[PDB]
């Protein structure tokens, strides 16, 4: 009977007593309310402090047994019931505390003490809801909108109560997509659904680069609410990340005020710091609304949202993909990329070999040296390879026969200031002789400057080479393509990454066609209406200031003049003002060039391989205007 | 030199060196990156582990002295600049170092070697902006929007350098009002910026009580973007609390899911838990859009927010407010206050001795006893006095002798499991004898209920009496009325408080009034246009469809039927199917209706006392459907 922890019941007959195990912030409160206190005692489990991690007894468990009483047929409650969430976190608690039972508290399992909470999974609301429990239910349900519960806290004590913990009502049970999908980046676009939002909500306020920085605050704020319903830090993380020169080869989040360091410097607070959109990211948002991909409901069905951006560069490729770490892809030059995607489409049967006459390899923001083509091969054959990433670092000779090292840029994601702080503790430790200073003068003019000041007797190379072994100055890229490839997880390949990115260009721009098309013949369609509508507008008038209402208008309208149930609608939502002597000619004039457009659409349509080269061009123009010079040398 | 924490320079002459303390996440990285590294090294100390509070030297600033090298004249750095921000928090850290420095380092501010950063402070933009460090400054710059810097954060590295570290241009220096307003509440509507801002978010999205309720994340997410841009944690946690029966007499938010308990059990997700607006609540908002109060800029300038809000109902007194705890004030009863408030309006002279004859005193959500008028009379008198709270208990008599003491109501915001908690202690502590066994059977059905097994040879009335004193069974209310009046914080006595609300009704309805008045006026003059147009609409068309352009349609319009830039402006905008027959007549029924309504406004406007008893009858009104009975009972 722990007082201030465990809240108790009346009951003192273990056979009445049932004990629930709930993840405190989960359902603590709530399950404290519905529960039946003459025979109902819960237990609320410091989520926190549970965190194979195995380890002496927590103080949570600790508590757990005390109130149990057997830790023995000593026991307090013949029930044990477990609540936990669905959720990724949920399921942890459930398995960490069964698992816990079987290793010191196994008769328990064996005496069928402990059961399995099972709250409701489904609300169909068609006010009127339903109460399913399984798919099966569910789709029966249905066919004599949905949401799902994924957690427990969604619910009051009542309903708690009656679905999940009333024995009248109550079904017990005795005795990780979503880990997936949220990491791993589309291999369409590169993003992996926070970046995606994040690019998104700045796209919907119209934070484009032409317009003013907004603060960093008003759009984490806003995709929080939106479409990611988690911590600020995890978004504003996230989106420092894609506006940092040394973190993103083509940063998409264009940044104002301190946004961190090489040294893990921290960004400053959201409400200070300002964002826009970079120019490039432009071109990954290019036509999101012609309908080029499709969109989904959001976390609560109140919003809409990408499952891709028509991402008109290679993003992932370009940008790479980061790290537990499921994958490891590095970025690479665009103007490579390009290349390389223009070599796939001049031939489908490209090798990896070939491919690579285009993509040198990896190519980071960080510059630095790459140390062979060897783990690139591995790495864009498989999906998989050791890539050696070393500094680029030189030795100076100056006074009285000292030396000097230099490193003017290091590997990719290395922390710098761990880097020099371990360094320091190498000479500390003596394990390192004839470093007499070392200073990291980095900054914006000089740019990364760690200088290593050797003495005379020393030698300065030996150390350098020392130093490639002993610490971070070299670092190992561990590369491992793993993409979302047609809604699940998989490896792959340099090629087959171009391929999955070519085959969404294709299919972008083909999908854009047909919406620009049919959103032409759309307006032809109003047009011809209008003109009619204007040329004949005396009899319009009258025919519509004899009608009384407005639906007997909408009648005569199509009757007398044939028009169409738009058509009809459009000429009653004219504006007066439309009636001017020079707006005949614009309708005319829009009219006889969008007849000429709607043409040229089918044009390209019609052929395939005109299409493919609307994308040749369009890439081509992207890589001329965006392109650079690569930073990271393959030397050897 | 510490290698990982302080970014060196080249320089090792102590004349020409600089060292620049600054906020770790404040402007760490960017004070490293616009720096001079050949003469400016760098230390930024980690602003949380610095937090009147002295103790043994701080890691952090163990550091800051092993950089400098003096703790004596073989000081490294001539000059040490505190580069801080403007905000309370940067204040602290200003303060904390100076006053740090004159303890154990006085020589150096004897000797003139620290000195204090100079940003600028203002950005007027009109792209051209404005550098200006001083308000005469600015005040000169306007007179031959403003954006005030308030933190080093916003600025980017280069103009970090360029305005505040580079010597040929800084402006070294050789050596409140956010905290108050950001926490008191306005005595207007009691509400305290985050909880206004949260009602008006709810407001602005339209979640009323008539819809469906929304997943939290959906109201921070948005508030936090555009009005309050700080933690997640700080909206959720407020707006939570605005949800809790146990909080708010009158809770205004209306919570589903998890949302904690007395116990100081945490709410849900805010992605699990839903909210929407309370009923109440809408007589908080009510008339917010009828220009009734006056909006303000937000807090980065593209948003509008209230300054206050209409508060159709005492919410200051009713709800309350709390606290370091600058103000302290108690929740009341509604029927009480309403009428106290009308029993103000019938004469302005009325003492508070009569307000107490409406008010009996406070009246807290959580019930329980209050133990006198004393407190009671001398906090509203004065704003200031102890008030005791008792929690309800009884004590009943079993079986063999056997006693039992049963709490049912305790006092107001008590963590009740902590008193559990405590009890429990006293007994191990073997402070009290008798206590046989304490449960907490507290639940939603049961409602509170904590049960105290006194034994056969135990005096259970003496232990209850002991709990008064050992225990928060009973527990002191420290009135303390200060609030936001007249943007300054003032303290308030009873009648005060409902002086400056009635005030502030007075205001709304006649602000509403006159805002009515002038919408409808408006609105009859487009009418009469628009009549005018129908009428001779043969005549409008062939005067329109004459003109070339609408700028002449307009200009002839006004012309030959004598319309005004409006109305004419509305003619054009008019739609075709506005020509219908039935049209004409709305037309003339909404204008005749109009007019009878324009003339009733007046009416009110003319007449002092007409608006003040709407004043009171809306007051009334409200009274009557949501004034409830008496929860505490003031006794003795
Ligand atoms: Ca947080």
Same mark, same amino acid.
């Given at each position: 009977s722990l007082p201030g922890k465990l809240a108790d019941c009346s009951s003192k007959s273990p056979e009445e007593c049932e004990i629930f195990l709930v993840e405190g912030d989960s359902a603590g409160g709530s399950t404290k309310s519905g529960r039946d206190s003459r025979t109902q005692a819960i237990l609320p489990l410091?989520?926190?402090?549970?965190?194979?991690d195995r380890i002496l007894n927590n103080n949570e468990i600790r508590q757990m047994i005390t109130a149990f009483?057997?830790?023995?047929?000593?026991?307090?409650?013949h029930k044990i019931v477990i609540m936990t969430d669905a959720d990724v976190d949920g399921a942890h608690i459930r398995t960490l505390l069964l698992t816990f039972f079987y290793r010191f508290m196994r008769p328990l399992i064996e005496a069928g003490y402990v059961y399995i909470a099972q709250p409701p999974l489904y609300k169909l609301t068609q006010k009127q809801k339903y109460y399913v429990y399984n798919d099966r239910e569910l789709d029966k349900l249905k066919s004599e909108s949905i949401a799902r519960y994924?957690?427990?806290?969604?619910?009051n004590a009542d309903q708690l109560w009656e679905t999940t913990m009333n024995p009248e009502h109550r079904a017990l049970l005795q005795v990780m997509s979503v880990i997936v999908a949220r990491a791993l980046?589309?291999?369409?676009?590169?993003?992996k659904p926070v970046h995606r939002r994040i690019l998104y909500g700045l796209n919907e306020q119209g934070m484009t680069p032409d317009k003013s920085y907004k603060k960093s605050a008003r759009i984490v704020g806003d995709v929080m609410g939106k479409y990611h319903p988690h911590g600020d830090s995890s978004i504003y993380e996230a989106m420092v990340r894609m506006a940092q020169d040394f973190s993103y080869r083509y940063p998409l989040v264009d940044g104002q005020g301190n946004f961190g360091?090489?040294?893990?410097?921290g960004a400053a607070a959201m409400r200070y710091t300002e964002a826009r959109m970079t120019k490039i990211t432009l071109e990954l948002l290019?036509?999101?609304?012609?309908?080029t991909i499709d969109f989904i409901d959001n976390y609560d069905g109140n919003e809409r949202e990408p499952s891709?951006?028509?991402?008109?560069?290679?993003?992932l490729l370009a940008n790479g993909a980061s790290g537990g770490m499921a994958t490891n892809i590095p970025p690479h030059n665009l103007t490579e990329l390009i290349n390389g995607v223009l070599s796939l489409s001049k031939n489908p049967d490209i090798s990896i070999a070939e491919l690579m006459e285009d993509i040198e390899g990896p190519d980071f923001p960080t510059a630095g040296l790459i140390l062979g083509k060897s783990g690139i091969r591995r790495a864009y054959e498989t999906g998989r390879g050791s890539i050696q990433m070393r500094s680029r670092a030189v030795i100076e000779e100056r006074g009285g026969g000292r030396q000097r090292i230099v490193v003017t840029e290091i590997p990719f994601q290395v922390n710098k200031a761990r880097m020099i702080e371990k360094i320091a503790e190498l000479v500390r430790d003596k394990k390192?002789?004839?470093?007499t200073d070392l200073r990291?003068?980095?900054? *914006? $003019?000089?740019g990364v400057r760690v200088v290593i000041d050797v003495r005379k007797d020393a030698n300065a190379s030996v150390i350098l080479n020392n130093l490639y072994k002993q610490t971070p100055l070299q670092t190992s890229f561990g590369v491992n393509m793993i993409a979302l490839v047609n809604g699940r997880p998989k490896l792959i390949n340099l090629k087959e990454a171009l391929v999955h990115y070519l085959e969404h260009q294709k299919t972008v721009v083909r999908r854009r066609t047909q919406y620009n098309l049919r959103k032409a013949k759309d307006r032809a369609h109003i047009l011809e209406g209008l003109r009619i509508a204007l040329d004949h507008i005396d009899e319009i008038i009258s025919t519509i200031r004899e009608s009384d209402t407005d639906k007997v208008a909408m009648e005569s309208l199509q009757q007398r003049f044939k028009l169409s149930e738009k058509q009809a609608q459009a000429i009653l939502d004219?504006? *007066? $003002?439309?009636?001017?002597?020079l707006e005949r000619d614009k309708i005319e004039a829009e009219y006889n060039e969008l007849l000429n457009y709607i043409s040229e659409l089918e044009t390209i349509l019609a052929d395939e391989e005109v299409l493919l080269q609307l994308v040749r061009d369009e890439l081509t123009e992207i890589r001329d205007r965006f392109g650079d010079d690569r930073r990271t040398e393959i030397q050897l």
């Open positions: 410091r989520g926190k402090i549970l965190n194979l009483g057997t830790g023995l047929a000593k026991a307090r409650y994924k957690g427990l806290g969604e619910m980046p589309d291999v369409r676009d590169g993003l360091s090489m040294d893990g410097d290019r036509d999101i609304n012609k309908d891709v951006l028509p991402a008109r560069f290679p993003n390192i002789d004839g470093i990291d003068e980095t900054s *914006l $003019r000089t004219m504006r *007066l $003002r439309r009636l001017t002597g």
